[PDB]
A = this chain, B = another copy of it.
Amino acid sequence: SSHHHHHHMKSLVGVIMGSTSDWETMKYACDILDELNIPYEKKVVSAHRTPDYMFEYAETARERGLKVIIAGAGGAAHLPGMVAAKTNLPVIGVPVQSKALNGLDSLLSIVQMPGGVPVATVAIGKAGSTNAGLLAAQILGSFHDDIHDALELRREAIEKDVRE
């Protein structure tokens, strides 16, 4: 069932990752977007195995109405940065926890982007993935007060739960 007939169901966030195994990490961002009723798309897009496709994905993101891209990658983690080099939409990079170096390689490859090409970097692993969802929502919430108000209530409920 398509949703071309609902502007409000059209993707605002693109959630991408270099491999299907990254989905174990990237699902957390998507759970947040589900919780906040923010429409999104999720795809495998590999910087190294599908480079042309990555460029196509990045180039067309804004015309397709995406406001934010969330990109996860591990090791020599180039996906977030190369997507960022190809769009001026904000790009959030989630370092996936790699086998040998526990995401230290992931983190440095993503966060140390040169002047001109920011990537919004979050924590290694599942906390970062959750936080990518939330940051995408915060970005949407800088224009849409309803989303902002919902983030406030969500945080307020957690505070109460933890404190009590």
Binding site for B on A (CB under 8 A): 18-19, 28, 44, 46-53, 55, 62, 67-68, 75-78, 81-82, 84-86, 88-90, 92, 97-105, 107-127, 130-132, 134-135, 138-143, 148, 151-152, 155, 158-159, 162-163
Contact = CB atoms under 8 A, between A and B. Distances in A.
Contacts of A112: 75-76, 98, 101, 105, 109, 123-124, 127
B109 A109 contact: yes
Contacts of A100: 97, 102-104, 124-125
Contacts of A132: 118
A41 to B, nearest CB: 15
28 contacts: A46-B162, A48-B85, A49-B116, A49-B155, A49-B158, A50-B163, A76-B108, A76-B123, A82-B82, A90-B120, A90-B139, A97-B100, A100-B125, A101-B102, A101-B108, A101-B124, A104-B108, A105-B109, A107-B107, A109-B109, A111-B122, A112-B124, A115-B127, A115-B130, A115-B131, A116-B155, A119-B122, A120-B120
